[PDB]
Amino acid sequence: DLADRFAELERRYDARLGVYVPATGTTAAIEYRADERFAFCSTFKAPLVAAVLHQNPLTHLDKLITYTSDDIRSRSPVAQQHVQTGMTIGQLCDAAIRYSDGTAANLLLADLGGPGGGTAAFTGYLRSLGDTVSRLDAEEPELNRDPPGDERDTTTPHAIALVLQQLVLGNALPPDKRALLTDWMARNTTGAKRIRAGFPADWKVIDKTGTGDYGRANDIAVVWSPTGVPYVVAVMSDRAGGGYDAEPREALLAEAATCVAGVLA
Ligand SMILES: *C(=O)/C=C\NCC(=O)CCO
Ligand SMILES: [Zn+2]
Ligand SMILES: [Zn+2]
Ligand SMILES: [Zn+2]
User: For residue 239, which of 66, 88, 145, 260 sits 20 to 30 Å off, Cα-Cα?
Assistant: First the structure.
């Protein structure tokens, strides 16, 4: 069955794989280690942007945030281009989603909850969406590096899927703010080889990736069939047996997505 097929992916990639797709009117839920904890890595940046959108008027997107070169302690290809002069909230949202910029996400955390309270406030946003499981405890780059088995900085496939479902398909956000989030996800530069690679080209896909130590590679997505029927897909993985420097395997996620697409076709 589907569980056997997912188990074979795990054997071949020497990995742990988590998959969740919510039920619809006509399709059963797809669940594989869906309630096991996996590190968010950069997947948290999608609800983070949602939180910042939700709590502020649209004009807040043009609020200028200044920061220094020494605020960059993580891979930040956009934020480095604009040090000292700063970046608007909107620019930070774009960078955090489309490039997975680390400093951009930290600055958004500070905008949401202040310098000390950002990770709690982010977690609290998830709580407001009924997610009582996920937790963000550290910011970039530490959130990508927690040991296997540690609950800190983790979500579950099930939990993050339900969050993304409310954000993109539900009414957690007003239409205008929702459209900004979905648009940034649609124009991301990091996700072509993950869930997108498992769905035929006539399906629409928007996603947010994450990558971390211990071979961590995640992708969360909303997809629409050629006739507009939506599904939410969360795929999470690690290769912790290889140690902190284990290589991530994007193709594992593409394969998991292909399995899902096959069932939903
Ligand atoms: C989001 O996932 C942002 C950064 N992740 C850290 C990274 O890619 C390094 C993995 O070794
Ligand atoms: Zn079997
Ligand atoms: Zn569950
Ligand atoms: Zn603000």
Answer: 260
Q: Which of 115, 132, 109 is nearest to 44 (CA)?
A: 109
Ligand 4 center–CA 51 separation, angstroms = 11
Q: How far is the CA of 140 from the centre of ligand 2 (A)?
A: 40
Please state, as a whole number, how many other Cβ atoms lie within 10 Å of the Cβ of residue 27: 13
Six-digit token string for 148: 């296997």
In this structure, what are the phi and psi dihedrals at residue 53, rounded to the nearest 5 degrees? -65, -50
- How many domains, the chain? 1
CATH of the domain at 139: 3.40.710.10
Give the residue, out of 45, 100, 140, with the most ligand 1 atoms within 8 A of its beta carbon, to mutate for a pocket test. 100
Experimental approach was X-ray
Structure resolution, Å: 1.8
Instruction: Write out the residue range of the structural domain in which residue 95 sits.
Output: 2-264
Contacts 24+ apart (CB under 8 A), 178-185: 180/53, 180/61, 180/93, 181/46, 181/49, 181/50, 181/53, 181/97, 182/206, 182/222, 184/49, 184/93, 184/94, 184/97, 184/98, 185/46, 185/97, 185/222
